[PDB]
Structure 1
Amino acid sequence: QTQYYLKYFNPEIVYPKNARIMLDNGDIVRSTVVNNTSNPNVDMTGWVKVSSVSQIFDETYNITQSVINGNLITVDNFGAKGDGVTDDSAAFQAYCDSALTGQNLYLGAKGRYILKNQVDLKGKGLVGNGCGKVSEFYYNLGCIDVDGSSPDLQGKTAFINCGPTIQNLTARCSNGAGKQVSFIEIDGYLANIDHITLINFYNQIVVKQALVGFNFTNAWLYYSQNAGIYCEDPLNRVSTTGTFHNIYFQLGDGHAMIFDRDVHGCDFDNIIFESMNGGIKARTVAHCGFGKFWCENLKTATSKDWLEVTGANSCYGNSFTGYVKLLGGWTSKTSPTLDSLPTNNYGGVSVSAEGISIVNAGNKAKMLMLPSGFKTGNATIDETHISSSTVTPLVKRRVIGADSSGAQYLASDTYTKLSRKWGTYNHGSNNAGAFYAPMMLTYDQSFSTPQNNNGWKIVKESTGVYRVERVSGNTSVITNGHIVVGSPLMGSRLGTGTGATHGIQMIETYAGSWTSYTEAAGFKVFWRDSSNALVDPHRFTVAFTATS
């Protein structure tokens, strides 16, 4: 009054419904009741503040601005400044303690949020305001900036009790060298971590308990002092089913990842180690998948394995199925071309352009396929059936030429207990053929015991008459076989040089077995001198086959 509007509360006045006056601070209040005689400066019953968002409406929706302000709540709602100077830890904590906030903590649109004290997320996840490059340009636009010089953070993790989300985040530690300040603690059971950039800290990601259903992707993890990702697993729960994809570890003083204990069934792919002092370290790595790794340079170390498994025979069952690039000091115990050890191999299948190989932890056996053919780690190559119960022989087929139409002809071999052959075929005359590796067997009267081949031995029956005979228990037979008798050493083991002439006679299995069915138990060799008298060589060879 008169030429401006201003009226303060007057205890003599009765204010009607909708009457407006000013509080002593100048803010306008509106009476919501008839006959209002209450002083709004001490009692707001029957009054509302007109500048409150509960009294402001969006006519598009016919709701209050108060309701619209529930759409997105951030740390800015709780007084966070994000100004690169002011400690926002209390505001972050108030956010996490509030009944109004959702599953995650959110940053405001723009801000470098300083934290000088530990924040207990109380099970809330963490969502930032962008996943930036490792530069001041991005830190100034949007990040969490933990004050590593703060005495209350020394030896501690900046965020504890994180929920199942860390995403869309840039977070650094400033002035924390030597202070062992780690960034965030998150439980290993059920996590999605994606699109993060972490800078400095001791341990960047501290996994609590053990991995299970833990997914981690698209992370730039720079300058950690101890580890990018650390999992102590103090109760030895055994980590499983963790995925680690698209991670760039750069210029860390320690390792990329440290598991103090055991990891099973985890997957690692498209990982970069650039100037780290260690790759992935674990006690036990079992049935894990490893894809592409790019390992280039070491910070201060001279030589490090990209994967370091400390337990004896504790690296096994793995799939090393991406190329591992090694430059500037990195080594590998998983290459297909690596020679096997008798024990403590990094067990698994290894597949890359280097080779296709497979090895177990506790044995020398290793097979490798290369463009040239095959290599073995134990000087042995087995060929058998997939079924352990099948006891048939194998047949090998091999291209040896063409048939008359010009198509490839694959010839079949034979390798049974009784026969070794390699098939062939004459397409001119249309006849099968074969090449033979016969049984060879030598008689020598100077042997302490008779030589035996496959259940046959040679014995003297009488002067000039020798039996190539079956020993007890040999029930196998010769069927239509080939027979060659070798050269005699006469008179002594050295031989005199005199000769002799041989003939043979078959030994039947039953009466008529040979005559009628070309089945024989064995055969006799008869030796005679130039006067056709029976004579005894000191030593002689025979060669024969058990089939045609």
Structure 2
Amino acid sequence: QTQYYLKYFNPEIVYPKNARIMLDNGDIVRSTVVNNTSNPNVDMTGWVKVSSVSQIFDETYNITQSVINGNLITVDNFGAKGDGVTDDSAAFQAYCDSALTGQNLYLGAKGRYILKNQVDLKGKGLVGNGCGKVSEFYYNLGCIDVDGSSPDLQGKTAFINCGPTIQNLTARCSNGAGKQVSFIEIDGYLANIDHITLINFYNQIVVKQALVGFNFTNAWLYYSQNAGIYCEDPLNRVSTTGTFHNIYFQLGDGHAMIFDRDVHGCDFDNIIFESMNGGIKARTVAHCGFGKFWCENLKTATSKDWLEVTGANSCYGNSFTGYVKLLGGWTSKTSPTLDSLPTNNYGGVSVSAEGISIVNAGNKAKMLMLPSGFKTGNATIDETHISSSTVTPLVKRRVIGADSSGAQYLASDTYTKLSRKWGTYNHGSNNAGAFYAPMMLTYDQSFSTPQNNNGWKIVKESTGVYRVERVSGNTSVITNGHIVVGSPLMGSRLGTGTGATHGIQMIETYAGSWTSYTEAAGFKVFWRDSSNALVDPHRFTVAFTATS
């Protein structure tokens, strides 16, 4: 009939260039060649389908719709339904096997994509259609929904061979309790994971080999059965330089993070553990940074450390430099106020409003600064030079008052091998002064061996005459020193109670050393009774200084 348009191929006809007819299925074809006698139903040489996007043009750019359709390709291009029912695993696989697709796999605008079989990403990363809250509202708008009841997924990871990107993604496992379905495997060398929400699964993120240049941020990781993030490191490569920031772990049956082996130089900050059964676990944690942690409640456990390091002396070199909030059963081995152990401390510096402290793994030494002052873990505080080769004494300066202008006066002490003093100053008369801790030394004829202080001993020279003298090898001297002789015990060690009167005489180092330069090797003590006869105490003390 001439009242509608419809012509099928006729073998008797010669079709000119640009002639249009219908294929037997009704689709229109256009001849691209002169003298066309080929049947387009069996042989499309010399014909094009007019309803193809390669034959549709955007006049704004003078290009085909075919070209425009290369701007963004998703799993929907390969037949994914995203309908919450149909298995889309074959469409996901076809995307990853395609020659047309780029670095990443993309989801379409709206969809709940069911997966019932493992997808091999073939090195492609994963970009979703939104990072949603943990609710059906968001799952229905955009997510990957792994069917954990699928026999082909039991004990397996849903996505393998992930590229260096996981982002902008909501992913859940439905009906997988007890089936050990993990979400994704990604290599530890070079990754950017950000803005993800993962729900259920056994291990949510499975890291292959070891971390290096691995960046993980802004993740809501809810209801994992074993771990949020799991790194086996089967070859013991040793993980390094991983960052873990802004991660919310909630209501996991296991740990937040499990490293079977060793972690060096990694950074963890702004992490939340809410009703988990474990925090971060590793064999070794070395030279890592830890910032703020908020640890609130345990799922079924009664007590757990926020950081658990299993190796002996294998937690060391760390920076615990943010406040760790502990509520509802969480504990810490990293608090500045924690007492040190002789070994197996969690080694590092700890800085928060609780205190500023520093400790090593394999020793009791620990220093803590608080608003009130200092605390030590080994009953000892050292003061020395930063340089190990410097061998001068130190000087301590301490505020003791005001000068004449009203400014703080800091007085200087002395602590050398030969002198212990504390300085002062009289600003009324403008004179320096000092308080002294003298050397004290006692003679006692009942001693088995003479008492020695700092290379000096007291010996009897003759009746009533005692030398406070230098022993062999003592080349130190007294310079203009102060001398006080103590009280004699006469007749016996207990004493009779009788008294005696003393005088002194200096012992020079060389002729005139004392007379001219007030240098002495020591001094003699002479003891006399009330008749002025020389007499021998059983015991007496002397006190002296080696400087003025």
> Which of the five TM-score ranges fits, normalised by the shorter chain?
over 0.9
* 2:91 aligned counterpart, secondary structure: helix
Q: Compute the displacement of 1:288 (Å).
A: 0.1
Tell me, what secondary structure is at the counterpart of 1:9? coil
Distance, in Å, in 2 between the alignment partners of 1:381 and 1:305 is 30
C-alpha deviations, 1:46-80, integer Å up to 9, x for none?
Answer: 00000000000000000000000000000000000
In structure 2, the partner of 1:90 is: 90
Task: Give the distance between the partners of 2:442 and 2:51, measured in 1 at CA.
Answer: 117
* Residue aligned with 1:236, SS: coil
The equivalent of 2:215 in structure 1 is 215
CA apart distance, 1:395: 0.0
Match of 2:449 in 1: 449
Q: Deviations over 1:17-61 (max 9, x none)?
A: 000000000000000000000000000000000000000000000
Displacement after TM superposition at 1:346 (Å): 0.1
Following superposition, the deviation at residue 251 of structure 1 comes to: 0.0
SS of 1:532's equivalent in the other structure is coil
Provide the C-alpha distance between the structure 1 equivalents of 2:9 and 2:115, rounded to a whole number of angstroms: 44
Once the 2 structures are TM-superposed, how far is the Cα of residue 370 of structure 1 from its aligned partner? 0.1
Q: Secondary structure at the match of 1:54?
A: helix
CA distance in 2, matches of 1:156, 1:531: 108
1:399 is displaced (CA, Å) by: 0.1
Aligned equivalents of 1:414, 1:242: Cα separation in 2: 51
CA shift, 1:518, in A, is: 0.1
1:196 corresponds to: 196
Give 1:321 shift.
0.0
Q: CA deviation at 1:388?
A: 0.2
Task: Tell me the distance in 1 between the aligned counterparts of 2:55 and 2:523.
Answer: 119
Deviation readout 1:413-465 (Å, 9 max, x if unpaired) = 00000000000000000000000000000000000000000000000000000
User: Deviations along 1:444-500, whole A, 9 cap, x unmatched?
Assistant: 000000000000000000000000000000000000000000000000000000000
Q: Which residue of 2 aligns with 1:535?
A: 535
Alpha-carbon distance in structure 2 between the residues aligned to 1:469 and 1:68 = 104
Structure 1 Cα separation of the partners of residues 319 and 177 of structure 2: 38
State the 1:311 CA deviation.
0.1
Shift of 1:260: 0.1
TM superposition shift of 1:516: 0.1
Task: Measure the CA separation in 2 of the matches of 1:167 and 1:27.
Answer: 41
Question: 5+ unaligned residues in a row in structure 2: which ranges?
Answer: none
Secondary structure of 1:178's partner?
Answer: coil
Which string of whole-angstrom CA distances, capped at 9 and with x for unpartnered residues, describes residues 140-164 of structure 1?
Answer: 0000000000000000000000000
Deviations 1:371-424, CA, capped at 9 Å, x for gaps: 000000000000000000000000000000000000000000000000000000
Partner SS state of residue 516, structure 1: helix
| Correspondence for 1:521 | 521
Deviation at 1:347, TM superposition (A): 0.1
CA distance in 2, matches of 1:509, 1:125: 87
Equivalents in 2 of 1:532, 1:111: separation in Å?
117
Residue 225 of structure 1 aligns to a residue whose secondary structure is coil
Counterparts of 2:393 and 2:169 in 1: how far apart (Å)?
64
SS in 2 for 1:527: strand
Structure 1: unaligned runs, 5 residues or longer: none
Cα deviation 1:481-540 (Å, max 9, x = unaligned): 000000000000000000000000000000000000000000000000000000000000
Separation (CA, whole Å) in 2 of partners of 1:465 and 1:311? 68
How far residue 213 of structure 1 moved from its aligned partner, in angstroms, is 0.1
Deviations 1:277-312 (A, max 9, x none): 000000000000000000000000000000000000
Between the aligned partners of 2:525 and 2:122, the Cα distance in structure 1 is 97
1:231-266 CA-to-partner distances (Å, cap 9, x unmatched) read 000000000000000000000000000000000000
How far does residue 270 in structure 1 lie from its aligned partner after superposition? Answer: 0.0
Equivalent position SS for 1:30: strand
Deviation of residue 11 (structure 1)?
0.2
Q: 1:475 — aligned with what?
A: 475
Distance 1:99 1:462 in 2: 112
Distance 1:8 1:345 in 2: 87
Deviations 1:182-236 (A, max 9, x none): 0000000000000000000000000000000000000000000000000000000
- Give the match's secondary structure for 1:94: helix
State how far apart, in whole Å, the 1-side matches of 2:119 and 2:373 are: 60
- Matched residues in 2 for 1:514 and 1:76: separation? 105
For residue 366 of structure 1, what is the aligned residue in structure 2? 366
Task: After TM superposition, give the deviation of residue 345 of structure 1 in Å.
Answer: 0.0
CA distance in 1 between counterparts of 2:216 and 2:453 reads 65
Q: Secondary structure at the match of 2:139?
A: helix
Q: CA RMSD in A?
A: 0.2
Once the two structures are superposed, residues 315-366 of structure 1 have per-residue CA deviations (whole angstroms, 9 ceiling, x without a partner) of: 0000000000000000000000000000000000000000000000000000
* Residues in 2 aligned to 1:151 and 1:511: alpha-carbon distance in whole angstroms: 106
Partner of 2:345: 345
In the alignment, the residues of structure 1 paired with residue 22 and residue 478 of structure 2 have an alpha-carbon distance, to the nearest angstrom, of 123
What TM-score do the two structures reach when normalised by structure 1?
1.00
CA distance, structure 1, for counterparts of residue 227 and residue 387 of structure 2:
47
Distance 1:74 1:431 in 2: 89
Alpha-carbon distance in structure 1 between the residues aligned to 2:140 and 2:533: 114
1 CA distance for matches of 2:367 and 2:177? 48
Q: 1:176 Cα shift?
A: 0.1
Residues 49-448 of structure 1: matches in 2 within 5 Å? Answer: 49-448=49-448
Aligned counterparts of 1:315 and 1:398: Cα–Cα separation in 2: 39
User: How many angstroms apart in 2 are the aligned matches of 1:531 and 1:112?
Assistant: 117
C-alpha distance in 2 between matches for 1:129 and 1:320 = 36
| 1:1-27 deviations in Å (ceiling 9; x for gaps) | 310000000000000000000000000
The DSSP-based 3-state class of the residue aligned with 1:139 is: helix
Report the Cα distance in structure 2 between the residues aligned to 1:449 and 1:142, rounded to whole angstroms.
92
CA distance in 2, matches of 1:156, 1:513: 93
Structure 1: 4+ residue segments shifted above 6 A: none
Between the aligned partners of 1:234 and 1:291, the Cα distance in structure 2 is 28
Counterparts of 2:224 and 2:101, CA distance in 1? 31
Report the number of matched residues. Answer: 548
- Determine what percentage of the aligned residue pairs are the same residue: 100
Does residue 25 in structure 1 map to residue 25 in structure 2?
A: yes
